[PDB]
Amino acid sequence: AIKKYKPTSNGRRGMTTSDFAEITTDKPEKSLLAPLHKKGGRNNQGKLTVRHQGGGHKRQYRVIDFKRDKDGIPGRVATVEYDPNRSANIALINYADGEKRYILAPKGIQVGTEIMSGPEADIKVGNALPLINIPVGTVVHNIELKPGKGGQLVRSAGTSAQVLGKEGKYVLVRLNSGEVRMILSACRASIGQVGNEQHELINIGKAGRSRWKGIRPTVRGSVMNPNDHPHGGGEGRAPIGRKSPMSPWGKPTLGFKTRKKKNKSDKFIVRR
Amino acid sequence: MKRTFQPNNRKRSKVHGFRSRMSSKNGRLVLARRRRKGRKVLSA
Amino acid sequence: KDPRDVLKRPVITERSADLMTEKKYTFEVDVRANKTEVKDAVESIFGVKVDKVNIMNYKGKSKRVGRYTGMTSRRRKAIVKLTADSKEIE
RNA sequence: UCUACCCAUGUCCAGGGUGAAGUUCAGGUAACACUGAAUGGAGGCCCGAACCCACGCACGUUGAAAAGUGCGGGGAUGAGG
RNA sequence: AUGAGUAGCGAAAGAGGGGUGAGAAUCCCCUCCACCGAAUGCCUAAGGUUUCCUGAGGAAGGCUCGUCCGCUCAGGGUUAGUCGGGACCUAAGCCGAGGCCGAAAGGCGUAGGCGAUGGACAACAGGUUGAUAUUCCUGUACCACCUCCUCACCAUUUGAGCAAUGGGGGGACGCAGGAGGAUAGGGUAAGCGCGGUAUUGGAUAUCCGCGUCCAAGCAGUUAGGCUGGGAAAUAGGCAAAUCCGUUUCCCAAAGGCUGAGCUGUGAUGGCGAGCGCGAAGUUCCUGAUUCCACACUGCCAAGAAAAGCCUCUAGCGAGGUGAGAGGUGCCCGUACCGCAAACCGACACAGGUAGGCGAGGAGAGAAUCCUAAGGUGAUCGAGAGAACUCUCGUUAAGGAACUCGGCAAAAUGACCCCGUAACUUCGGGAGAAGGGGUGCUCUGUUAGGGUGCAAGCCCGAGAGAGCCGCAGUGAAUAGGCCCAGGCGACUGUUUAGCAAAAACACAGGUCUCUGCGAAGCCGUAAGGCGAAGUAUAGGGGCUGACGCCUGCCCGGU
RNA sequence: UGAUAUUGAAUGUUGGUUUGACCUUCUAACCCGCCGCCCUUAUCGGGCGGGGAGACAGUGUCAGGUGGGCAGUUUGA
């Protein structure tokens, strides 16, 4: 599962990692790789728009079939692989037509396991289906909000979503946020809790490791100057000094629901 | 000590250069100003 | 276009002397021309063959006359190596 | 073209030391646990040159210098230069 | 003008003899001496733009002089199919037809194209002038292309052959560690050659000095490294398929890709001590920071693209393929400086300036001291040797009484052996502290190891005897240590140019937001970061490792 | 946040005089950083076909609230 390093040094002290036991290999498929270049939080305009990003180890994108458009084609798992671009792991699978793809990595999955993605398929792990053919009481991921678009949902590691019922064209679904939602029924989804399941259970141990992950430091606003942040200023270390904690851009943070009120998906959602 | 001016003719010609000034409106206006005065060296 | 317009004039130095002893002559040329042009120019003018050509181009020396500090014109000098079994030149 | 940050691609870090994880052996245990060696070679690890930075002093303070020099100093395979 | 002929004349060893010249500390030559030597040496960028070389000159500049030059005048000097860059590739980024937005201007952005700091790519070894040279000359080669030609083969419609701007492969990749192999290089250890055997006492050999090589390409070979192969069938590889990929069968070492280097050639030449000529030109040892090579192993933070190349068919296909012979091969740059007096610092400025090579002894070492190769003697001097200032060295007895304060300085310092505490997150503390020993000779070419076929070269623990000194890491360099406390867990970052910190950050913790066209943020908007991510994620706030904990109040905001 | 224009077709409902308002529903408007095909070797857009949402949203005009996020200013003798 995880490793717990010994305290040979104050930086290595407290550190934990994964054993990467689930992994099988150390090299991906060139056919499915693609390039990246970091962005440092900057935009088209060059201006910085998001903080706390930039300067990590470089990476190379692993293309993914979040759609499972292929149907009636039995695939077979070949490998499990590391993707730096995500909490989860991935699985390289090979279809009978010679095509090869990556997918997300559920838990309890092994090499040699076979896969089908079409509606008539079975409801075991790794397979993919529309929510109609999927029954109630199932654990699901890479859920898609629109048919053909691919999963824009539970993809992350250790995550899972439960199914609850139907309304015909729409389907009730629980989400890892704890949230209930109506989703169009023809939209596909893939079965099984996502694999890694312990990514959260890590002590990064030091700062350099987050820098390697590409996270730049975070400066608190209570030490900035008032030109820069509201909390900034004050002779000596000082408290907030106003009605609420506030953002650098003059908005509150705690409790202030940011979602739009006139939004339309409010119809489809139920609770949270 | 290290100082401000570290010459690179490429950077000079790609910033303060003729193609660049002619690229933009405001750079054209320079050349206008920089002619009716009568400057021999109107740009890099 | 004409070879007569290609070539401009020779270069008379002790270097050029030493070289015409060794059958390879020199010239100076319009700045745009090239090696093959000058080769065919020589062949067409003097009726002589060529072993090879080696070509150069110098910048303009700055000068001074009173306050005035202009620059000399540029130059494109070209060394040509006649074959053996080839003619010489005046 | 300084400088702050970022992006892409390159490049530099004399030597020496410590000795982790893991593996094997032996003791040990019902099994383990645990213990001792060998291998192993980690580390924002150690000492310390290049390199980088600037704490302590002195000097200079119409200077060699519009921010330095000298003697020491800190980091020196990582948040590196 | 004064200040005042005052300050300063910008780190650093020079002296003498000759010469030149109207005129010499300052220019040239010689001899000695001294400095550098992981640099003050060789290459080379950016940048400078003639400063290069030669010959004249000394009005200015040179912090003086000047017969001199990075100054002034004249002249001259930079030679490329293979080097670097273009007629090749693309990243970041930039431009951007059409288009999308926008009071205008313009912004965004597709196709497409620019764009190296990377990829790919054919030539080396010797001379050469005052100045260029893997560019010129001499030798030997290689790459691409062309056919007036020669040869061999194949075929003209199943018609041999060619290779898509398409597909596939490959290019194509991190970081660390360590063994191996080889080589540059080094040693002079042998052996060889050349020269000398000297005058200060001594030495014919048991001596001294100097030198003891040669590519690219071609043929062969290899340490090794990788890679499992063969036969059929194919829901895919935007059209197709003998190529890919997938599956099933038969074999299990062979095969292929590679491969540093090595041997012969190249070499009936060149180089070469030394004197236009020219001897020996081998072996042994050591041995990389370099190559095999990111090859292997391990690790996680999971390590560019495209084109060259190969292949597939599609398509073109009536003359082609191969070899030889002959022939063609453009543009830019090439001088010179490049830790410097030519660059950036207003200066001939004690500063800064990327990268490659980088010797010997002692040495772990690019440290350090002294020296090689090679380069310098530094742009004012001589002369007295006082107060004072600076940088240094010694010091009686005392020993921190000085002092805000042991600031500064001194002291310690290397290697080996013994020994090493409270405490602890059990890892450390710890080089704790503290003690002790180091030199030379003989046993001894040692016990022993590496190499070697052996001889013969390298490394060299330990003890025994002995010898000297005040003193044996005899010089330079290389911890001062301990007790306790506060603050911050730590490594790190910061007020360039007063403040390095208890400040910032940090990993960790917690709260909150956000269901994906997220949220937030930039922008008038389009368009974007977020994210080619999806609540084990992203953003914001506060707190700051770890351990024990984090109590009462929701009245007010 | 509301009114109004884009923004129309219905079934009901309740009001006073047909009318407007309200709830449901539909689609053709509008929208889609959903799919497929062509433009086209194109992750732009733009045409077709579907699909999803839907007279909502978005946008324009008007109005109220909040609003040191920002600006101009005052803060006596």
GROMACS .gro file of N, CA and C in nm, chain A residues 34-149:
model
  348
   34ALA      N    1   0.133   1.234  -2.569
   34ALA     CA    2   0.119   1.364  -2.632
   34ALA      C    3   0.194   1.465  -2.547
   35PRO      N    4   0.232   1.578  -2.604
   35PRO     CA    5   0.317   1.672  -2.531
   35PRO      C    6   0.237   1.763  -2.440
   36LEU      N    7   0.311   1.824  -2.348
   36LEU     CA    8   0.262   1.933  -2.267
   36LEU      C    9   0.370   2.037  -2.252
   37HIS      N   10   0.328   2.153  -2.206
   37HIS     CA   11   0.420   2.254  -2.160
   37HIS      C   12   0.349   2.328  -2.049
   38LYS      N   13   0.422   2.353  -1.942
   38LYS     CA   14   0.361   2.416  -1.827
   38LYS      C   15   0.325   2.560  -1.862
   39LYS      N   16   0.246   2.621  -1.775
   39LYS     CA   17   0.186   2.750  -1.802
   39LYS      C   18   0.201   2.851  -1.690
   40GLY      N   19   0.236   2.808  -1.570
   40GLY     CA   20   0.267   2.901  -1.465
   40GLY      C   21   0.151   2.986  -1.421
   41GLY      N   22   0.030   2.944  -1.451
   41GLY     CA   23  -0.086   3.021  -1.417
   41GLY      C   24  -0.115   3.135  -1.512
   42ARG      N   25  -0.032   3.155  -1.612
   42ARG     CA   26  -0.052   3.262  -1.706
   42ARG      C   27  -0.157   3.223  -1.809
   43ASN      N   28  -0.194   3.320  -1.893
   43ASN     CA   29  -0.298   3.302  -1.991
   43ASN      C   30  -0.252   3.338  -2.132
   44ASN      N   31  -0.347   3.339  -2.225
   44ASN     CA   32  -0.322   3.390  -2.359
   44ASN      C   33  -0.260   3.528  -2.356
   45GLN      N   34  -0.306   3.610  -2.263
   45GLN     CA   35  -0.265   3.748  -2.250
   45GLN      C   36  -0.129   3.763  -2.185
   46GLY      N   37  -0.074   3.654  -2.131
   46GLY     CA   38   0.050   3.660  -2.057
   46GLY      C   39   0.033   3.694  -1.911
   47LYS      N   40  -0.075   3.761  -1.875
   47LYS     CA   41  -0.098   3.795  -1.736
   47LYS      C   42  -0.120   3.669  -1.655
   48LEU      N   43  -0.080   3.675  -1.530
   48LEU     CA   44  -0.108   3.569  -1.436
   48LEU      C   45  -0.249   3.584  -1.383
   49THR      N   46  -0.321   3.473  -1.379
   49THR     CA   47  -0.460   3.471  -1.340
   49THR      C   48  -0.487   3.380  -1.223
   50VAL      N   49  -0.405   3.280  -1.202
   50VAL     CA   50  -0.417   3.188  -1.090
   50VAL      C   51  -0.281   3.176  -1.025
   51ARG      N   52  -0.281   3.174  -0.893
   51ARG     CA   53  -0.158   3.175  -0.818
   51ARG      C   54  -0.114   3.032  -0.790
   52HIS      N   55  -0.001   3.020  -0.724
   52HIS     CA   56   0.040   2.898  -0.656
   52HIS      C   57   0.077   2.787  -0.753
   53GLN      N   58   0.100   2.821  -0.880
   53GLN     CA   59   0.132   2.724  -0.982
   53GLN      C   60   0.259   2.762  -1.054
   54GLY      N   61   0.334   2.660  -1.093
   54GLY     CA   62   0.448   2.676  -1.180
   54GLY      C   63   0.575   2.614  -1.129
   55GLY      N   64   0.647   2.548  -1.218
   55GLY     CA   65   0.785   2.515  -1.196
   55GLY      C   66   0.812   2.373  -1.152
   56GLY      N   67   0.730   2.278  -1.195
   56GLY     CA   68   0.744   2.141  -1.153
   56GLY      C   69   0.819   2.055  -1.253
   57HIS      N   70   0.827   1.927  -1.220
   57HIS     CA   71   0.882   1.831  -1.313
   57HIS      C   72   0.797   1.829  -1.438
   58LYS      N   73   0.861   1.806  -1.551
   58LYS     CA   74   0.786   1.805  -1.674
   58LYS      C   75   0.719   1.670  -1.693
   59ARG      N   76   0.624   1.668  -1.784
   59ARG     CA   77   0.531   1.560  -1.799
   59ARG      C   78   0.502   1.541  -1.946
   60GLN      N   79   0.423   1.440  -1.977
   60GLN     CA   80   0.391   1.410  -2.115
   60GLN      C   81   0.256   1.342  -2.116
   61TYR      N   82   0.161   1.402  -2.186
   61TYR     CA   83   0.021   1.370  -2.167
   61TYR      C   84  -0.011   1.232  -2.218
   62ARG      N   85  -0.086   1.159  -2.138
   62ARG     CA   86  -0.137   1.028  -2.174
   62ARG      C   87  -0.279   1.047  -2.221
   63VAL      N   88  -0.303   1.020  -2.349
   63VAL     CA   89  -0.436   1.037  -2.403
   63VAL      C   90  -0.528   0.930  -2.347
   64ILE      N   91  -0.654   0.966  -2.329
   64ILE     CA   92  -0.750   0.884  -2.256
   64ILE      C   93  -0.877   0.873  -2.337
   65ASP      N   94  -0.940   0.756  -2.329
   65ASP     CA   95  -1.074   0.736  -2.382
   65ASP      C   96  -1.171   0.752  -2.267
   66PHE      N   97  -1.208   0.876  -2.241
   66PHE     CA   98  -1.313   0.904  -2.146
   66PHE      C   99  -1.452   0.880  -2.202
   67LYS      N  100  -1.463   0.838  -2.327
   67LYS     CA  101  -1.590   0.825  -2.396
   67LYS      C  102  -1.639   0.682  -2.403
   68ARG      N  103  -1.548   0.588  -2.426
   68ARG     CA  104  -1.584   0.449  -2.448
   68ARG      C  105  -1.683   0.436  -2.563
   69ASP      N  106  -1.659   0.513  -2.668
   69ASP     CA  107  -1.745   0.506  -2.785
   69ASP      C  108  -1.740   0.369  -2.850
   70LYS      N  109  -1.629   0.298  -2.834
   70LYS     CA  110  -1.616   0.165  -2.891
   70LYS      C  111  -1.709   0.069  -2.818
   71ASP      N  112  -1.782  -0.011  -2.895
   71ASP     CA  113  -1.882  -0.100  -2.840
   71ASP      C  114  -1.884  -0.230  -2.918
   72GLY      N  115  -1.918  -0.337  -2.848
   72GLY     CA  116  -1.918  -0.468  -2.909
   72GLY      C  117  -1.781  -0.518  -2.944
   73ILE      N  118  -1.678  -0.464  -2.880
   73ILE     CA  119  -1.539  -0.500  -2.908
   73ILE      C  120  -1.475  -0.542  -2.777
   74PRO      N  121  -1.453  -0.671  -2.752
   74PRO     CA  122  -1.395  -0.710  -2.624
   74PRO      C  123  -1.248  -0.672  -2.617
   75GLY      N  124  -1.215  -0.591  -2.519
   75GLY     CA  125  -1.078  -0.555  -2.491
   75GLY      C  126  -1.022  -0.636  -2.378
   76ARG      N  127  -0.891  -0.628  -2.363
   76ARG     CA  128  -0.818  -0.702  -2.262
   76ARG      C  129  -0.718  -0.608  -2.200
   77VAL      N  130  -0.712  -0.607  -2.068
   77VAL     CA  131  -0.612  -0.526  -2.002
   77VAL      C  132  -0.475  -0.583  -2.033
   78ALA      N  133  -0.378  -0.494  -2.048
   78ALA     CA  134  -0.240  -0.530  -2.069
   78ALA      C  135  -0.152  -0.480  -1.956
   79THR      N  136  -0.171  -0.355  -1.914
   79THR     CA  137  -0.084  -0.299  -1.811
   79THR      C  138  -0.158  -0.198  -1.728
   80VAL      N  139  -0.096  -0.166  -1.615
   80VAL     CA  140  -0.133  -0.056  -1.530
   80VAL      C  141  -0.014   0.038  -1.524
   81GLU      N  142  -0.042   0.168  -1.527
   81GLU     CA  143   0.062   0.267  -1.545
   81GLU      C  144   0.035   0.390  -1.461
   82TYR      N  145   0.144   0.460  -1.436
   82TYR     CA  146   0.145   0.585  -1.363
   82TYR      C  147   0.118   0.698  -1.460
   83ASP      N  148   0.030   0.789  -1.420
   83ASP     CA  149   0.008   0.913  -1.492
   83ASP      C  150   0.039   1.027  -1.397
   84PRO      N  151   0.140   1.110  -1.423
   84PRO     CA  152   0.163   1.225  -1.335
   84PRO      C  153   0.052   1.326  -1.340
   85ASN      N  154  -0.032   1.321  -1.442
   85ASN     CA  155  -0.131   1.422  -1.468
   85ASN      C  156  -0.257   1.404  -1.387
   86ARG      N  157  -0.257   1.314  -1.290
   86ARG     CA  158  -0.380   1.281  -1.220
   86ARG      C  159  -0.348   1.196  -1.099
   87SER      N  160  -0.438   1.203  -1.001
   87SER     CA  161  -0.423   1.126  -0.880
   87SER      C  162  -0.425   0.977  -0.908
   88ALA      N  163  -0.504   0.937  -1.006
   88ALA     CA  164  -0.528   0.797  -1.030
   88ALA      C  165  -0.414   0.735  -1.108
   89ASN      N  166  -0.429   0.606  -1.133
   89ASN     CA  167  -0.349   0.532  -1.227
   89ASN      C  168  -0.434   0.507  -1.350
   90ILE      N  169  -0.370   0.453  -1.453
   90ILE     CA  170  -0.438   0.421  -1.576
   90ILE      C  171  -0.409   0.277  -1.612
   91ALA      N  172  -0.481   0.232  -1.713
   91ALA     CA  173  -0.472   0.095  -1.760
   91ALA      C  174  -0.465   0.098  -1.910
   92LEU      N  175  -0.361   0.038  -1.964
   92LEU     CA  176  -0.351   0.017  -2.107
   92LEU      C  177  -0.419  -0.114  -2.139
   93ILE      N  178  -0.510  -0.107  -2.234
   93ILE     CA  179  -0.592  -0.218  -2.277
   93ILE      C  180  -0.581  -0.228  -2.428
   94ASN      N  181  -0.602  -0.349  -2.478
   94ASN     CA  182  -0.583  -0.382  -2.618
   94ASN      C  183  -0.709  -0.451  -2.666
   95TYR      N  184  -0.764  -0.403  -2.776
   95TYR     CA  185  -0.882  -0.463  -2.834
   95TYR      C  186  -0.845  -0.563  -2.942
   96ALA      N  187  -0.944  -0.643  -2.978
   96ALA     CA  188  -0.924  -0.746  -3.079
   96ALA      C  189  -0.893  -0.687  -3.215
   97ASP      N  190  -0.933  -0.564  -3.242
   97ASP     CA  191  -0.904  -0.501  -3.369
   97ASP      C  192  -0.762  -0.448  -3.378
   98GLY      N  193  -0.680  -0.472  -3.277
   98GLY     CA  194  -0.546  -0.420  -3.273
   98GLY      C  195  -0.535  -0.281  -3.217
   99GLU      N  196  -0.647  -0.213  -3.197
   99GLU     CA  197  -0.643  -0.082  -3.136
   99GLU      C  198  -0.602  -0.094  -2.991
  100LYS      N  199  -0.539   0.012  -2.942
  100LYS     CA  200  -0.490   0.020  -2.806
  100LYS      C  201  -0.540   0.149  -2.745
  101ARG      N  202  -0.571   0.144  -2.616
  101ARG     CA  203  -0.618   0.263  -2.549
  101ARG      C  204  -0.576   0.261  -2.404
  102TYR      N  205  -0.579   0.380  -2.346
  102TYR     CA  206  -0.571   0.400  -2.204
  102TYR      C  207  -0.709   0.426  -2.149
  103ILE      N  208  -0.729   0.385  -2.025
  103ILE     CA  209  -0.846   0.421  -1.950
  103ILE      C  210  -0.805   0.445  -1.806
  104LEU      N  211  -0.902   0.486  -1.727
  104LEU     CA  212  -0.884   0.499  -1.585
  104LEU      C  213  -0.875   0.361  -1.522
  105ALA      N  214  -0.827   0.361  -1.399
  105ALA     CA  215  -0.787   0.240  -1.329
  105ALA      C  216  -0.878   0.217  -1.209
  106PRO      N  217  -0.976   0.131  -1.218
  106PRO     CA  218  -1.055   0.099  -1.099
  106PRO      C  219  -0.975   0.019  -1.000
  107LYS      N  220  -1.038  -0.016  -0.889
  107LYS     CA  221  -0.975  -0.099  -0.788
  107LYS      C  222  -1.016  -0.243  -0.807
  108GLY      N  223  -0.931  -0.333  -0.759
  108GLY     CA  224  -0.953  -0.474  -0.777
  108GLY      C  225  -0.933  -0.524  -0.918
  109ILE      N  226  -0.887  -0.439  -1.008
  109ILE     CA  227  -0.866  -0.478  -1.146
  109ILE      C  228  -0.728  -0.539  -1.160
  110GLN      N  229  -0.715  -0.631  -1.255
  110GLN     CA  230  -0.591  -0.701  -1.280
  110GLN      C  231  -0.570  -0.714  -1.429
  111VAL      N  232  -0.448  -0.750  -1.465
  111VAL     CA  233  -0.414  -0.772  -1.604
  111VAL      C  234  -0.477  -0.901  -1.652
  112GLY      N  235  -0.508  -0.905  -1.781
  112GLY     CA  236  -0.579  -1.015  -1.841
  112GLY      C  237  -0.729  -1.003  -1.831
  113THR      N  238  -0.778  -0.914  -1.745
  113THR     CA  239  -0.921  -0.895  -1.732
  113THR      C  240  -0.976  -0.834  -1.859
  114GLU      N  241  -1.092  -0.882  -1.901
  114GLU     CA  242  -1.153  -0.836  -2.024
  114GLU      C  243  -1.262  -0.735  -1.998
  115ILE      N  244  -1.294  -0.661  -2.103
  115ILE     CA  245  -1.374  -0.539  -2.096
  115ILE      C  246  -1.467  -0.533  -2.215
  116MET      N  247  -1.587  -0.483  -2.191
  116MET     CA  248  -1.678  -0.442  -2.296
  116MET      C  249  -1.748  -0.316  -2.249
  117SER      N  250  -1.784  -0.233  -2.345
  117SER     CA  251  -1.833  -0.099  -2.319
  117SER      C  252  -1.971  -0.072  -2.377
  118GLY      N  253  -2.028  -0.166  -2.451
  118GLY     CA  254  -2.155  -0.144  -2.515
  118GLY      C  255  -2.272  -0.176  -2.424
  119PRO      N  256  -2.391  -0.128  -2.460
  119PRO     CA  257  -2.504  -0.132  -2.366
  119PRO      C  258  -2.541  -0.271  -2.320
  120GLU      N  259  -2.533  -0.369  -2.409
  120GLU     CA  260  -2.565  -0.506  -2.374
  120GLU      C  261  -2.461  -0.569  -2.282
  121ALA      N  262  -2.349  -0.502  -2.257
  121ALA     CA  263  -2.241  -0.562  -2.182
  121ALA      C  264  -2.284  -0.591  -2.039
  122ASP      N  265  -2.196  -0.661  -1.969
  122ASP     CA  266  -2.219  -0.697  -1.831
  122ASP      C  267  -2.176  -0.583  -1.740
  123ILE      N  268  -2.222  -0.589  -1.615
  123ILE     CA  269  -2.208  -0.479  -1.522
  123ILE      C  270  -2.089  -0.497  -1.429
  124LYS      N  271  -1.995  -0.583  -1.464
  124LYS     CA  272  -1.879  -0.601  -1.380
  124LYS      C  273  -1.785  -0.482  -1.397
  125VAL      N  274  -1.668  -0.493  -1.336
  125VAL     CA  275  -1.581  -0.379  -1.320
  125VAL      C  276  -1.506  -0.352  -1.449
  126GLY      N  277  -1.483  -0.224  -1.477
  126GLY     CA  278  -1.411  -0.180  -1.593
  126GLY      C  279  -1.499  -0.155  -1.713
  127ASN      N  280  -1.607  -0.231  -1.726
  127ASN     CA  281  -1.699  -0.211  -1.835
  127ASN      C  282  -1.766  -0.076  -1.824
  128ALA      N  283  -1.826  -0.034  -1.934
  128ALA     CA  284  -1.892   0.094  -1.944
  128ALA      C  285  -2.026   0.076  -2.010
  129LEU      N  286  -2.120   0.162  -1.973
  129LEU     CA  287  -2.258   0.142  -2.010
  129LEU      C  288  -2.331   0.274  -2.000
  130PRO      N  289  -2.447   0.285  -2.063
  130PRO     CA  290  -2.540   0.391  -2.028
  130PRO      C  291  -2.615   0.362  -1.900
  131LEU      N  292  -2.658   0.470  -1.837
  131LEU     CA  293  -2.721   0.463  -1.707
  131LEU      C  294  -2.851   0.386  -1.711
  132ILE      N  295  -2.913   0.379  -1.828
  132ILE     CA  296  -3.036   0.303  -1.842
  132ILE      C  297  -3.008   0.156  -1.815
  133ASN      N  298  -2.918   0.099  -1.894
  133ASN     CA  299  -2.882  -0.040  -1.879
  133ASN      C  300  -2.813  -0.067  -1.747
  134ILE      N  301  -2.756   0.035  -1.685
  134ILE     CA  302  -2.698   0.018  -1.552
  134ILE      C  303  -2.811   0.009  -1.450
  135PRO      N  304  -2.808  -0.086  -1.356
  135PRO     CA  305  -2.914  -0.092  -1.256
  135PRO      C  306  -2.888  -0.002  -1.138
  136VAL      N  307  -2.979  -0.005  -1.042
  136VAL     CA  308  -2.963   0.072  -0.920
  136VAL      C  309  -2.866  -0.001  -0.828
  137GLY      N  310  -2.794   0.076  -0.747
  137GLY     CA  311  -2.706   0.018  -0.649
  137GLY      C  312  -2.572  -0.021  -0.706
  138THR      N  313  -2.509   0.070  -0.779
  138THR     CA  314  -2.384   0.043  -0.847
  138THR      C  315  -2.288   0.158  -0.825
  139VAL      N  316  -2.159   0.126  -0.832
  139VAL     CA  317  -2.052   0.222  -0.809
  139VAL      C  318  -1.985   0.250  -0.942
  140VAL      N  319  -1.971   0.378  -0.973
  140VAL     CA  320  -1.953   0.423  -1.110
  140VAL      C  321  -1.849   0.534  -1.110
  141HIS      N  322  -1.785   0.552  -1.225
  141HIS     CA  323  -1.697   0.666  -1.244
  141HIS      C  324  -1.699   0.707  -1.391
  142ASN      N  325  -1.609   0.799  -1.424
  142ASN     CA  326  -1.599   0.873  -1.551
  142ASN      C  327  -1.736   0.904  -1.611
  143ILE      N  328  -1.824   0.954  -1.526
  143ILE     CA  329  -1.959   0.983  -1.567
  143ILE      C  330  -1.959   1.104  -1.658
  144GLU      N  331  -2.044   1.101  -1.760
  144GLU     CA  332  -2.054   1.209  -1.856
  144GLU      C  333  -2.189   1.277  -1.845
  145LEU      N  334  -2.186   1.409  -1.855
  145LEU     CA  335  -2.306   1.490  -1.849
  145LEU      C  336  -2.379   1.498  -1.981
  146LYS      N  337  -2.309   1.477  -2.090
  146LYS     CA  338  -2.364   1.485  -2.223
  146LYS      C  339  -2.317   1.363  -2.302
  147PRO      N  340  -2.402   1.305  -2.385
  147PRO     CA  341  -2.359   1.189  -2.462
  147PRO      C  342  -2.253   1.227  -2.563
  148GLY      N  343  -2.151   1.143  -2.572
  148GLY     CA  344  -2.044   1.162  -2.666
  148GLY      C  345  -1.931   1.249  -2.616
  149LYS      N  346  -1.954   1.325  -2.510
  149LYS     CA  347  -1.854   1.421  -2.466
  149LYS      C  348  -1.745   1.355  -2.383
   0.00000   0.00000   0.00000
